[PDB]
Amino acid sequence: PVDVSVSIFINKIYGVNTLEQTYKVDGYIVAQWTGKPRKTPGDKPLIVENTQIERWINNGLWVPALEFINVVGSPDTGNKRLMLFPDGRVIYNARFLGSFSNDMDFRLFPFDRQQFVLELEPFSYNNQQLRFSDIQVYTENIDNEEIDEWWIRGKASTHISDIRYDHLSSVQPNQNEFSRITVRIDAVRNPSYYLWSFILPLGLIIAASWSVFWLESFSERLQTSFTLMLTVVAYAFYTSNILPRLPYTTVIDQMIIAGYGSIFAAILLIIFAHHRQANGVEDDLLIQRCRLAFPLGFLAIGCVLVIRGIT
Template sequence: MFSVKRRVVIHVTFIKIGEINTLKETFDADVLIRAKWREPRLDKSNTQELDQDSTDWSQYWNPKLFIENAVGEPKSNSSHQVEYGSNGEATMLERVRFKGTFLEQMELWEFPFDLQDLTVNVMSDMPSTEVEFVEDPDEIHRIFKQSFIDEQEFYLYKYIDSESKELQKDRADPFVRRSVLTVRCRAARRPWCFIWNHFAVTNRLQLAFTLMLTNVAFKFVITQSLPRISYLTYLRKVKEQALRRHSTHTGKKADAKGIP
């Protein structure tokens, strides 16, 4: 068994970002993870020419990658190949594609002007004493915006952030820590459908009554779209101020028209 800590180079590509569900605090995604590590057993000095099509890859070391914040068991498929350097040293290349739903704690204090992180936590099934994650120094993480499904509600940035850390994954054994590479992209909500055009000032009395009734229905719709949170969002603060303003405005208009 390989006794030295393995250095695994990780590269992540967001192939597709699906629906962003703020109520369930999840998002759908199709993610490709590319991992590379040294495999001395396959060096040209240690083995004959390798037939990669018929090789049983399960007999070689593998970091056993998975996405820690996935909901359930995402669909996945993998492929392997070996690359050789000029000195005959072998590097194992594994591509794993995950397609599923992933958890994300939504930041809704500034709703509907909120900016959401969409994160995948790449983790190994082995402890950090055996595996070390390193980002690919030759290629940055990538994201394809063209296939973003929620384009009408969110704007997806090309920006990608990442960080490496260690986490305690197994509560039964608190001394075992695992390497994690967190890769996140960002999406900003398009607020225009939540903003009323206040420049149209005709028929203010009728409009004030309509807005009061709309506020009631709007609150119901919003509660179906957001998780049950204990803090006030920007939208809720504005809505409550608008309700008080519309009530006052309606009363003044009614007095001016002599409505009892």
Template sequence: MHQKIVCLFTFFSLYLPINVPKVIAQEVSQQETTYQISQRPDTDNPTEVAVGVYLIDFDTFDEIDESFKLNGYLFLTWQDQRLAFNPSQTAVNSKTYNIGEIWTPNIKFLNIESVRETAYILLKVEPDGTVHYKERFTGQFNSEMNLQRFPFDRQKLRVIVEALDNIENIVLLADNSKTGAAKDAFLTGWRIRDFQAFPRVRVSEVEEESFSEYVSEINILRYHNPYIWNVFLPLLFIIIVSWTVFWSRSFESNTVIATSSLVSAIAFNIVVVEELPKVSYLTFINGFILIVYVFICLVIIYTVVKHWLDLEKKKELSLKIDRTARWLVPAVFGVSNIILIAASLL
């Protein structure tokens, strides 16, 4: 009996010192592993993150406020070898995680007006450690627009993604395979032409650091045909009608034609003004309307001068001016619009 007790005591004394440290070591190892996963995959080198923004559709578009609201997908892809696994041992070809369970890059939309709305987020890891981040989002974005060529303008709508960590920690790359738009994406009054994406570096003068950015540009072209039919052609007809005074010798008729043309142009402008962008600079269509006003006013002045020449018995001079004005005024009108077109292209 005494020998049995000695054997049991010897067994426990040998077992406990050896195995208790092993258990403690395993727990510490698990804590260290969890802690490391919460850090960047490679702390010695910058983590490269491929970014893609895919447009589903536009919700709103305000060219005056230079803003637009869209919903789409945000794609992020990076490599994390710590998450690699053997699919033959796990019986799965990919693993899914929740936000907070693994490291994810700290990024933001730089030109968003408020916090973006997120419908859902998917995190999937492939056997080689490639991590795929997919987010369905909605956001109101600001993007500078130039309406000087309105209504023949083209705009670039930008969505800018920036890493909150400096470029020494995170480098953003453009994933062109995940940049684009759905076939049924639609923007009223505009045609979606193409997309382009590129990375760039922003240098912060305040923080004296450099940050990596991803820029997605959506190129859109305005449908200008409605403005040609509803604005340019009617005003062109009005100005052409006013030029009939160059063939008429009746002061009363010429006065009616000239004043009627001016009143028609003013009334027409009142009707279409709501369709024109309210900006602080002169657009192409504003320039055209202004030229029409100037030439109608010149016609009114011409009518008065011609009548004065007739009263002064200077009919020959009046006829000579008529013959010159018949080709000179339309020519100057055409040149004025060519100058306007050239100015809008600068």
């Protein structure tokens, strides 16, 4: 088995696509193994750049192809380089930008924690085995972290494992296990834009909706409920036009649904308080009792949604 040591440098993680559950990573790959001794000009390391690599492969140089098994498409490889030492060592160094996919769950959207993952695996070998994985995310974004969309916690997690492919050759004593390198980078979204421009104003609109119980006429309470209903629709548009698309409801959308429910429940109470001929449009304490019971009932419902997400 040819031992291969790998170092991954991460320069930039960006472009998270929520519907496809993909993200872009730009960085370097440094693979190093040990072949047989060779003679190089000047008995010093020999450097072979981008298009000269292909001429060495045709002459019989063994350069294993390393594939990302989560990449969507083909990574946009930039500059490549080989460094053939006279004692046998070979260092392969490449620049990559690709779109990677992972199971990402945005159900706590403004406060979600993701885990960007890179999986590396030799494309056509089972007994060329990876030993060391060093991940150097040298971008110490701890400084000026508050201007970045994603905060990166911890350094990185590396893991060398053996993946078994049972859908393989009949003769598979050890001919169906492939070495795999997994890199995990934890991240936390930056909940400042979504906490000041989406959640705070939505709390004020819903809070102002309970003001409808302070008007002093049945006709006034009903008519201003439709303006409130139009305000929430105009707010669900401002939200859905900015927030990322998802196949489930986040915590912002569940507040909007509660906004529709609060206004609609107010309309039923306004109508019921007016047309029950036991309190009627005369002295009626159902409205006064509703000035207090509506904020409390909504606050309790806000707690049920706040424990559903955490659990």
